[PDB]
Structure 1
């Protein structure tokens, strides 16, 4: 079951404007919520819906997954603003990131060390907060980073393929969709997901920033990426890559998870030369 709480909003307060994409449990909308925030009468929102076709078990799964976000207070993680458990459809309301995901943003720029370093620090800020709170993201990638009106980068999750980035995922038959080009050697081999496997992924995100979001390991198939990465292979230095940004990547791609820096260590090294 699920017990309604202080996060509950009256369905009458949410109007739905247009659709943004598909989503795991149903349709995702851009909308407006009324008195959901202090000193702000209306708020532009993202609405995640449970498909009306979905079962009882899966409506409660959805609510209990999204309740994890009630614990979070980091301006660098997309913020939950409210739930609607009562009646149909079942909604969760969230901060609207008006400039979309970081991969689309990067591809549309088809920047300086300072902008790349800023974007990196903001990403490392949300991930440090999540990892400290026992939250291992498991799909950290530019496509899951969101960009606000003010150009702030936040950690989100725009499910797992929206079709748009369907080449980013490998179907391991029955298993499911794996983002293999972002996965650490211990994740690929043993299904080990830790803070250290999030740090590996962050290195791939830095490579995505430096290449304006090229596909990692372009011209290797999904199975060749597995073999290459498990046997100690590394992405090449992006063209025009500043030294500092590539040193950070390499730190993140130590084969032994224990030799990688923590997100806190990454924020320190970034701040020390800002």
Structure 2
């Protein structure tokens, strides 16, 4: 059984909470490699499956994902209810996030003539705060996420009381132990794709890009640019323009996250303070989002 170390504590497969297979029921599909289902343990859960047709490395990858998530303890990181590894197909049981992934949510919940008030600036700032809180927890525990992006964040529900959480740790799992074309280039700082140097300032840069994703309401970063075009653009000092209708104070947080030198970028404590300040400013939160 492989070892995993987080916050100076070592855990093993033995430490995972094995849930008897007979106590688990799959209800409906929700959706890469493997499937996700809504399930019941009654406790409602998301069930991530490992394909029975997989390599030994896939098995270790699946195991490591379970270890990583089970060891986090924070409200803005999805909980692991347990695992079912002693029957096939193997399961990881996760907190059910009924709002789905954040990118899909933003794109589907954009204000329109049919839904003119579907979303407001405050909703977006609350999502940003939620994820920044999760990032701060990772930073203070010296865990580098390496792929902070809207597709990897999840929502507890569609409606107002929604809470956003970091939900996917596949990149960090891979690095802990893929290819050039699969690297999240558009979310990476200059020193990362060049020198392969990663620190928590790596996550600060990515969070800036996530902020752009959020306030653009789910657009792909660097519109019309390919991965290599972005690499050369960012390496040369180029940065994204503000999303449509983006308040200046919010754009300013993005531009600080994208400082070329990592030491010049804010830690997540500071990012949280700035997000809070924006949230207090009536001129920010009374800004209308564009209607499609």
TM over 0.5: yes
Q: Is the CA contact 1:143–1:158 (under 8 Å) kept in the aligned structure 2?
A: no
Aligned counterparts of 1:178 and 1:234: Cα–Cα separation in 2: 19
Provide the residue aligned with 1:84 in structure 2.
84
3-state SS in 2 of match to 1:94: strand
Q: Which runs of 5+ in 2 are unaligned?
A: 3-12, 111-118, 172-177, 281-292
Alignment of 1:223-238 (within 5 A): 223-238=228-243
Aligned residues: 252
Shift of 1:176: 5.1
Matched, 1:19 2:29: yes
| CA offset digits 1:196-215 (Å, max 9, x no partner) | 11111111111111111112
Shift of 1:159: 5.4
Q: Pick one of 129, 149, 173 that aligns with 1:141.
A: 149
Provide the residue aligned with 2:75 in structure 1.
75
| CA offset digits 1:206-234 (Å, max 9, x no partner) | 11111111121112222111100111110
Shift of 1:113: 3.3
Q: Pick one of 197, 202, 206 that aligns with 2:207.
A: 202
Aligned counterparts of 1:181 and 1:126: Cα–Cα separation in 2: 21
3-state SS in 1 of match to 2:100: coil
Q: Is the CA contact 1:113–1:242 (under 8 Å) kept in the aligned structure 2?
A: no
Q: Is the CA contact 1:59–1:90 (under 8 Å) kept in the aligned structure 2?
A: no
Alignment of 1:173-192 (within 5 A): 174-175=179-180, 177-192=182-197
Q: Is the CA contact 2:192–2:202 (under 8 Å) kept in the aligned structure 1?
A: yes
Q: Is the CA contact 2:189–2:205 (under 8 Å) kept in the aligned structure 1?
A: yes
Q: CA RMSD in A?
A: 2.0
Provide the residue aligned with 1:152 in structure 2.
163
Q: Is the CA contact 1:188–1:230 (under 8 Å) kept in the aligned structure 2?
A: no
Matched, 1:99 2:99: yes
Greater alpha carbon shift after TM alignment, 106-115 vs 147-156: 106-115
Q: Which runs of 5+ in 1 are unaligned?
A: 34-41, 161-172
| CA offset digits 1:139-191 (Å, max 9, x no partner) | 1111111011241110111858xxxxxxxxxxxx9545111111111112122
Summarize the Cα distance change of 1:6–1:250 in structure 2 as closer, same or farther, 3 Å threshold: closer
TM-score normalised over the length of structure 2: 0.80
Higher relative contact order, chain-length normalized (CA < 8 Å, sep 6+)? 2
3-state SS in 2 of match to 1:21: coil
